[PDB]
Design a protein around this ligand. Sequence first.
Ligand SMILES: Cc1ncc(COP(=O)(O)O)c(CN)c1O
Ligand SMILES: Cc1ncc(COP(=O)(O)O)c(CN)c1O
Ligand SMILES: Nc1cccc(C(=O)O)c1
Lengths: 427, 427
Amino acid sequence: FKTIKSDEIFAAAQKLMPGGVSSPVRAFKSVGGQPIVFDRVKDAYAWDVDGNRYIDYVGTWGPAICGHAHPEVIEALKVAMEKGTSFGAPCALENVLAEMVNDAVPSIEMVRFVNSGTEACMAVLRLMRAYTGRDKIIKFEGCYHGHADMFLVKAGSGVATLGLPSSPGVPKKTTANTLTTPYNDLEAVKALFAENPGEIAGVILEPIVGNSGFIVPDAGFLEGLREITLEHDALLVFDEVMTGFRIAYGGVQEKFGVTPDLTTLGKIIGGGLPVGAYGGKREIMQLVAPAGPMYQAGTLSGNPLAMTAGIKTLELLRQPGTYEYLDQITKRLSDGLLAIAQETGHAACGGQVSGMFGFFFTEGPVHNYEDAKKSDLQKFSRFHRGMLEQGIYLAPSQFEAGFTSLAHTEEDIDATLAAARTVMSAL
Amino acid sequence: FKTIKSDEIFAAAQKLMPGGVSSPVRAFKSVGGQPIVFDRVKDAYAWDVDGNRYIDYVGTWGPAICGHAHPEVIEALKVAMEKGTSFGAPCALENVLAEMVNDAVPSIEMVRFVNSGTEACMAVLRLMRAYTGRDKIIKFEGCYHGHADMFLVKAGSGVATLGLPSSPGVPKKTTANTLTTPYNDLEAVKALFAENPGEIAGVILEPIVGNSGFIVPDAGFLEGLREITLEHDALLVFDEVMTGFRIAYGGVQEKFGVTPDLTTLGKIIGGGLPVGAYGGKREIMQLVAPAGPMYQAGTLSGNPLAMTAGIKTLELLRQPGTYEYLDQITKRLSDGLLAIAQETGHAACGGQVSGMFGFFFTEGPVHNYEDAKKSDLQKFSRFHRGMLEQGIYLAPSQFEAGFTSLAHTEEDIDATLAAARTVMSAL
Ligand SMILES: Cc1ncc(COP(=O)(O)O)c(CN)c1O
Ligand SMILES: Cc1ncc(COP(=O)(O)O)c(CN)c1O
Ligand SMILES: Nc1cccc(C(=O)O)c1
């Protein structure tokens, strides 16, 4: 297994960008060693700069639900770009996408496009405050909602993977309005409310966690959150940037039946291009400029290319059998990966919901971040390298959810299991 | 001059999105309130959803310097999209793009790509505060540095256009670690520093403002700023998101010989695709994850399509007589406008540096925001609507700089001055 090309390129990159990467998660810093420079990606596969081919389970971290380089998405983008990549003015495409999103998502009645998850979460942060007139916010421990200053407290994603403290650069003055708490812990929430009357604007959370491993809400936990926030005139916000259009057409809020007041979207909505969105109840959105006082600008927000990619992407998920297939194939992978773990003598656990899954090297179960932190990070490290040299690409972290697409085949699954068997037999 | 389709389309939009747009300035609120919807852009022109052709001076807010729909930029993108549009792992393109940017801009010894100028603006503040260990930041009235919390106070763009105030979702707890001074007031700055010892991280500003109208730095303004920050061990940061590559290849810092410690880029570097970047001295960039403790990530960061359109744009700008041609046409146009005003009895003033200019309905001269606010916005509103009917497209705000391209011909410059005359002979 040669990685000479990925090696030279990565070495050069370190003298050019901080740690040779455009993002901390692309760093194999915890998973032992150096990364893989990709060359191209198509369907469920990816080819590095040395020729090795892999079956992808990362999918550019989420957008790829239809599979890489999807023919219908890439031709629609071909024709579209003949008209120019950006206007800086309205274009009918915005209406078409805005319309689709309102339909797709239950809570959403009025939308605002933006350029990424980080901008959507940051905008919804502000809006929460402006709308309620309150300063404090309740975010759970291990969750990630971008790197907006106030969210840089007890974050997951790369902060966990890298083992970093909270912040460095965000004033104490602002971090103080961020009240934290263990995921799945309803009692902690209540205690925070009764102890800070008239100050809590809302609760924000990953309806199903993906940045501290994969974690599902406890039975009743979401409903409880709808129930208590209503009682204190507080806002319930679901960061569905990563679960949006993946867990279900309308997301966790549609699947599990609970409707928030504001939701954020990203990833899959771009179709592979930079796109984010935030929206919800009409009366809350009215506070956004140029309709209301809360200002939020964007030179490239709503550009035609991003709009096109997303439109097409959504038209495909809308076809029959979409979410069934995703469930079907991801169940086999999860069950099989667990089946093998037992059969080879290793403590393990995880599960899946539609096209998203997780698998930890511990007995479990995992209900929160602290539980997640008990995984044998040393074992996962040797298991990753193993899965690698066998042609399977996984999130270089024990703290990320794995993804599955409509391009993955029953055969791709089996080939994965087979390699998982081979790898675990040593360890 | 019919705008039927643009009207029904914008009308429908207001039901779907806040204000019916994606960035505030597109609502046309300052110039009558009735926007036109684009269908396509090419070379130096734009086209309505009604069939009208305009000569563009907005150029998508900066990015289209080489002209709309550049043949070489789009063919290049059509070639790269067959290899997928988003990887999630490193790619050779980031290295080549990075290397080019380090070469181009003085201050930059190490860069980090992001998805927007806003993101880069969030980031540089946090980095500057983290590096020094101080929380006070100094900013100027009318300078836009991304719709973020800490900076939504007397900002530019929509703010310095439709009179947007301070805060819009940002508490007194955010906009309190930030100080303010009138752009161009060296004394106020020395004051602020003396008035606040050992607690100012640095100064961030637009080297040339385009967000409060086009405004150039006075005599030894920048030179002064560098010398004072140096003395206090404070950082000098240049938001060159607008100026970079448009004023000069190395932006304003290269043009006026002053070198800041860090700088932010955006717009042009992505060739009309969601992109941004921030870089500066090595020793400081080290603190950025994963190389350092300060967190900042981005899913779509450093993607291939954006890196591809960035490189083709920088290649075209590196050709012979690039910035020469812009200075040449932008002067003929800037002067042409100012001449027609003197001859039609309308007081006005303006100016240009390379392919960027300004034109204010007042005798000026404009040295700051207050100065900018003595403009006759009723005349502008009317003036603007006039030009729109002659087929010339201008920034729908008196506080927004105009832009020129390498596709604008001498003849397009002549015909605008023609409209400029037929129109100014009214009002
Ligand atoms: C739940 C969630 N929200 C937001 C983000 C960050 O948004 P983006 O990277 O699109 O800026 C991520 C990134 N993996 C995420 O998973
Ligand atoms: C100087 C400056 N800084 C930051 C920004 C933010 O730009 P973007 O739309 O890329 O987030 C702008 C946008 N007009 C700008 O003019
Ligand atoms: N999940 C996640 C979070 C942040 C960045 C990335 C990335 O690929 O650059 C992915």
